[PDB]
Amino acid sequence: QESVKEFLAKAKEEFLKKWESPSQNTAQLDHFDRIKTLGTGSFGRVMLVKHKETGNHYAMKILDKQKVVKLKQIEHTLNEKRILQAVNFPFLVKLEFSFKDNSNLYMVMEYVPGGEMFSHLRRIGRFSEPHARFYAAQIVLTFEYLHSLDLIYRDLKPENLLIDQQGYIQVTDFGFAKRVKGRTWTLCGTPEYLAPEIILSKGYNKAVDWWALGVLIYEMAAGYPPFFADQPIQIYEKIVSGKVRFPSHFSSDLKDLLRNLLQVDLTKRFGNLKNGVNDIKNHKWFATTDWIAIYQRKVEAPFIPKFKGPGDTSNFDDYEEEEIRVSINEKCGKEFTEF
Ligand SMILES: O=S1(=O)N[C@@H]2CNC[C@@H]2Oc2ncccc21
Ligand SMILES: O=S1(=O)N[C@@H]2CNC[C@@H]2Oc2ncccc21
Numbered sequence: 001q002e003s004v005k006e007f008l009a010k011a012k013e014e015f016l017k018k019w020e021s022p023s024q025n026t027a028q029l030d031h032f033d034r035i036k037t038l039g040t041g042s043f044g045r046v047m048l049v050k051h052k053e054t055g056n057h058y059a060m061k062i063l064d065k066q067k068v069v070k071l072k073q074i075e076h077t078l079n080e081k082r083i084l085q086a087v088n089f090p091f092l093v094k095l096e097f098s099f100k101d102n103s104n105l106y107m108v109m110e111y112v113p114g115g116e117m118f119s120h121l122r123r124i125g126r127f128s129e130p131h132a133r134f135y136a137a138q139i140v141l142t143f144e145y146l147h148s149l150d151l152i153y154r155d156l157k158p159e160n161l162l163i164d165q166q167g168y169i170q171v172t173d174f175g176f177a178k179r180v181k182g183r184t185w186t187l188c189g190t191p192e193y194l195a196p197e198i199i200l201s202k203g204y205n206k207a208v209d210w211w212a213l214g215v216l217i218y219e220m221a222a223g224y225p226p227f228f229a230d231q232p233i234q235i236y237e238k239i240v241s242g243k244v245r246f247p248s249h250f251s252s253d254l255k256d257l258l259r260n261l262l263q264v265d266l267t268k269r270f271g272n273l274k275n276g277v278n279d280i281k282n283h284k285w286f287a288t289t290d291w292i293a294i295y296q297r298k299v300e301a302p303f304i305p306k307f308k309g310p311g312d313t314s315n316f317d318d319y320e321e322e323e324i325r326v327s328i329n330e331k332c333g334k335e336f337t338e339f
């Protein structure tokens with residue numbers, strides 16, 4: 001379709017302009033009041049903050065430079081910020097500011113008060129097929145966009161998909177995203193969502209995102225992912241086996257789509273064939289989907305999260321509140337020069 005081609009051509013032009021001249025150092029920490037920790041991990045956390053001058057709320061991802069270095073995440077962190085400042089798509093979180101100080105890297109993003117899809121999925125148990133399909137269509141369009149820019153996302157899972165005030169998805173967490181022409185090799189991602197070629201240490205490509213979409217759609221519609229176990233090695237054995245069991249409540253169209261996304265041979269996997277994303281968009285399971293209406297955000301969402309206002313944190317959970325320390329001395333300045 002000419003409209004799609006012209007759209008993706010302009011999308012790549014606009015991405016490349018920002019990719020080649022990234023923004024840096026667009027705020028500082030004391031421009032914000034810290035409100036609450038929204039999530040925490042091994043080298044950083046995300047905090048709800050309020051900008052003092054404007055009153056606007058934001059999600060501030062804070063990465064400890066020393067821990068980033070220790071966990072060998074320098075390149076990944078530089079990828080994340082460079083990609084986020086260059087992308088623009090309705091279902092991608094907007095990066096509003098970035099900056100660094102003696103201790104930390106900061107990415108200040110739009111705050112999405114509806115919470116993680118993970119929470120709603122576990123609360124409701126499973127999504128109906130129409131509900132899962134509404135979210136899946138947004139991911140399909142987002143991956144069509146990212147892949148057209150030579151970006152691989154590499155961290156699709158329910159915790160990384162926030163639900164906004166209109167009930168639409170905002171993809172967060174570009175920590176593993178990478179601009180790749182051709183193949184890449186890093187072992188990264190969450191075990192349940194890894195394609196076989198990642199587990200087998202192969203050079204892999206954007207087809208791993210389409211595999212992860214298969215896992216996500218299965219998990220949304222079943223309530224649990226297709227490959228699970230207590231030990232990652234047992235998960236990996238199931239992933240590489242070519243065996244998936246579907247709940248009997250799955251429609252035949254859903255099972256067919258999932259057999260083609262959860263295709264262990266990457267050369268036969270939907271999204272990675274000659275017709276690319278169109279094998280997915282034209283699949284029977286998406287027959288009711290108005291792709292343009294989804295992109296234009298004209299479809300009524302199946303679900304609007306309950307929240308009281310732009311600063312409401314009720315849909316996020318409670319974490320120990322720790323200091324945001326900024327050392328009197330600069331740490332790892334050389335490593336993060338480009339940030
Ligand atoms: O609530 S989160 O902390 N959940 C996830 C944990 N890391 C990926 C997601 O990061 C976030 N990004 C923006 C806002 C909130 C969050
Ligand atoms: O639900 S939104 O208020 N927020 C979302 C988060 N930023 C992108 C989305 O923006 C929107 N665009 C159109 C209608 C509604 C919305």
Ligand SMILES: O=S1(=O)N[C@@H]2CNC[C@@H]2Oc2ncccc21
Pocket residue numbers: 072075186
């Ligand atoms: O620790 S790494 O092995 N992590 C990533 C794996 N492939 C890209 C990165 O390669 C590296 N380049 C230089 C030093 C260390 C590494």
Ligand SMILES: O=S1(=O)N[C@@H]2CNC[C@@H]2Oc2ncccc21
Pocket residue numbers: 165308309310
């Ligand atoms: O609380 S809102 O859903 N509605 C508000 C009423 N006037 C506009 C405001 O829009 C919002 N913008 C960002 C987050 C939440 C909201």
